[PDB]
Design an enzyme around this catalytic site. Structure first.
Site, PDB file in Angstrom:
ATOM      1  N   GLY A  43      60.964  55.754  23.682  1.00 26.27           N
ATOM      2  CA  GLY A  43      61.333  54.528  24.354  1.00 26.27           C
ATOM      3  C   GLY A  43      60.373  54.266  25.494  1.00 26.27           C
ATOM      4  O   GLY A  43      59.267  53.798  25.254  1.00 26.27           O
ATOM      5  N   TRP A 111      57.328  58.200  23.670  1.00 26.22           N
ATOM      6  CA  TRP A 111      57.614  58.385  25.092  1.00 26.22           C
ATOM      7  C   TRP A 111      58.153  59.811  25.260  1.00 26.22           C
ATOM      8  O   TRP A 111      58.001  60.419  26.314  1.00 26.22           O
ATOM      9  CB  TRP A 111      58.630  57.359  25.614  1.00 26.22           C
ATOM     10  CG  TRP A 111      59.472  57.887  26.757  1.00 26.22           C
ATOM     11  CD1 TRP A 111      60.731  58.409  26.667  1.00 26.22           C
ATOM     12  CD2 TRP A 111      59.084  58.021  28.136  1.00 26.22           C
ATOM     13  NE1 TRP A 111      61.151  58.861  27.899  1.00 26.22           N
ATOM     14  CE2 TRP A 111      60.160  58.637  28.816  1.00 26.22           C
ATOM     15  CE3 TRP A 111      57.935  57.681  28.859  1.00 26.22           C
ATOM     16  CZ2 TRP A 111      60.121  58.922  30.190  1.00 26.22           C
ATOM     17  CZ3 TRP A 111      57.896  57.963  30.227  1.00 26.22           C
ATOM     18  CH2 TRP A 111      58.984  58.578  30.874  1.00 26.22           C
ATOM     19  N   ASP A 265      48.748  54.258  13.836  1.00 25.68           N
ATOM     20  CA  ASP A 265      49.821  54.115  14.814  1.00 25.68           C
ATOM     21  C   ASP A 265      49.388  52.917  15.671  1.00 25.68           C
ATOM     22  O   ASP A 265      48.331  52.950  16.305  1.00 25.68           O
ATOM     23  CB  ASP A 265      49.915  55.405  15.642  1.00 25.68           C
ATOM     24  CG  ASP A 265      51.045  55.382  16.650  1.00 25.68           C
ATOM     25  OD1 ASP A 265      51.515  56.476  17.024  1.00 25.68           O
ATOM     26  OD2 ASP A 265      51.456  54.283  17.083  1.00 25.68           O
TER      27      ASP A 265
HETATM   28  C1  LIG Z   1      59.748  56.875  17.156  1.00 24.40           C
HETATM   29  C2  LIG Z   1      60.377  56.694  18.537  1.00 24.40           C
HETATM   30  C3  LIG Z   1      61.819  56.226  18.380  1.00 24.40           C
HETATM   31  C4  LIG Z   1      60.344  58.014  19.305  1.00 24.40           C
HETATM   32  C5  LIG Z   1      59.600  55.652  19.291  1.00 24.40           C
HETATM   33  N1  LIG Z   1      59.197  54.401  18.949  1.00 24.40           N
HETATM   34  N2  LIG Z   1      58.532  53.858  19.946  1.00 24.40           N
HETATM   35  C6  LIG Z   1      58.478  54.730  20.970  1.00 24.40           C
HETATM   36  C7  LIG Z   1      57.854  54.609  22.277  1.00 24.40           C
HETATM   37  O1  LIG Z   1      57.974  55.455  23.143  1.00 24.40           O
HETATM   38  C8  LIG Z   1      57.012  53.358  22.473  1.00 24.40           C
HETATM   39  C9  LIG Z   1      55.580  53.641  22.931  1.00 24.40           C
HETATM   40  C10 LIG Z   1      55.201  52.485  23.825  1.00 24.40           C
HETATM   41  C11 LIG Z   1      56.510  51.900  24.337  1.00 24.40           C
HETATM   42  N3  LIG Z   1      57.628  52.417  23.469  1.00 24.40           N
HETATM   43  O2  LIG Z   1      59.157  55.920  20.606  1.00 24.40           O
END
Ligand SMILES: CC(C)(C)c1nnc(C(=O)[C@@H]2CCCN2)o1
Length: 313
Positions: A43, A111, A265
């Site tokens: 997140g 994250w 990614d």
């Molecule tokens: C796969 C998972 C649920 C861990 C996930 N998906 N996106 C994230 C993140 O941490 C992203 C990276 C930039 C901002 N949010 O983490």
């Protein structure tokens, strides 16, 4: 290709009071006598899923999973008070003492890899091994890539939806513009922006389009997700310098680690994983061809399963 272990319920769970207005949800899965490990969700503000339990051998691992402050089942929902990287690091130590763990394997992706690094570099002694995926170190270049100009060029039609509610001036700094709306006194204004922000991510974390993405638009999830993410990015992850997590790698180089990153990614560029591996020669790097960001991308999941299995003998 290796997949998840069969579904299973946690054998224990509860809420831990942090003393500063937070009651964080946690749960223990696997073997109460098994090898200790902690799962760090992404997140920020993403929350845990029952499927995250199936990432560790049920017979050999004692897994602690928890919802970080303000999301999932942790209360208060969508709260930004006392919600910073360093509080979360403290929360992990709190949970560790609770479960009576002296040292454990830290599993974190996205994250979760960011917090895993922050934690490990703060309490090296408490980390036995690390399994990292979709490396994110919070550098300005990373935030710019995903939220200002970069991934936008691969999903131009999706990025236009994100900008649809912003004026010409606001488009100069999308993070800042959304921060205003996400912190508006008007809940409707918050929700409209929360949904747009969350769906952008939901539709760009897998190589191919997924039906899973629609869940990112669910009101309660999206509200906390966007508010918390935007809050952390607005404060640069509460790091003291742009490359804090990379320059403090020396503190954890002696720790066994596996890095798994998808070639395509779009949320976190493979460059981040390459940069980390360059500063951490001891770590094992796996760049998965034909894979996106998400942990359940076939090729990424495969490498994750093999990593936890091997660390459990
Ligand atoms: C796969 C998972 C649920 C861990 C996930 N998906 N996106 C994230 C993140 O941490 C992203 C990276 C930039 C901002 N949010 O983490």
């Amino acid at each position: 290709l290796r997949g998840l272990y069969p579904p299973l319920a946690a054998y224990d769970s509860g809420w831990l009071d942090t003393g500063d207005g937070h009651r964080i949800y946690w749960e223990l899965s696997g073997n109460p006598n098994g090898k200790p490990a902690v799962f760090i969700h992404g997140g920020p503000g993403g929350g845990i899923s029952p499927h995250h339990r199936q990432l560790f051998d049920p017979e050999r691992y004692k897994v602690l999973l928890f919802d970080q402050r303000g999301c999932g089942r942790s209360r208060p929902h969508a709260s930004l008070d006392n919600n910073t990287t360093w509080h979360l690091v403290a929360d992990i130590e709190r949970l560790r003492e609770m479960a009576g763990v002296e040292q454990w394997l830290v599993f974190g992706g996205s994250w979760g890899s960011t917090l895993a690094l922050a934690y490990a570099q703060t309490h090296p002694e408490r980390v036995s091994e690390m399994v990292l995926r979709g490396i994110f170190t919070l550098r300005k270049q990373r935030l710019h890539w995903y939220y200002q100009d970069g991934a936008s060029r691969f999903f131009p039609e999706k990025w236009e939806r994100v900008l649809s509610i912003l004026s010409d001036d606001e488009r100069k700094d999308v993070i800042a513009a959304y921060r205003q709306r996400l912190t508006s006194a008007d809940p409707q204004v918050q929700l409209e922006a929360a949904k747009l922000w969350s769906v952008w991510e939901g539709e760009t974390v897998t190589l191919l389009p997924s039906r899973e993405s629609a869940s990112f638009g669910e009101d309660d999830f999206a509200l906390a997700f966007a508010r918390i993410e935007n809050h952390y990015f607005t404060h640069l992850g509460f790091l003291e310098s742009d490359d804090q997590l990379l320059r403090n790698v020396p503190l954890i180089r002696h720790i066994p680690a596996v890095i798994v990153h998808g070639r395509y990614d779009m949320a976190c560029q493979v460059q981040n994983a390459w940069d980390l591996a360059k500063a951490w020669p001891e770590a094992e790097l796996h760049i998965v061809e034909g894979a996106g960001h998400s942990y359940d991308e076939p090729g990424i999941l495969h490498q994750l399963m093999i990593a936890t299995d091997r660390f459990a003998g």
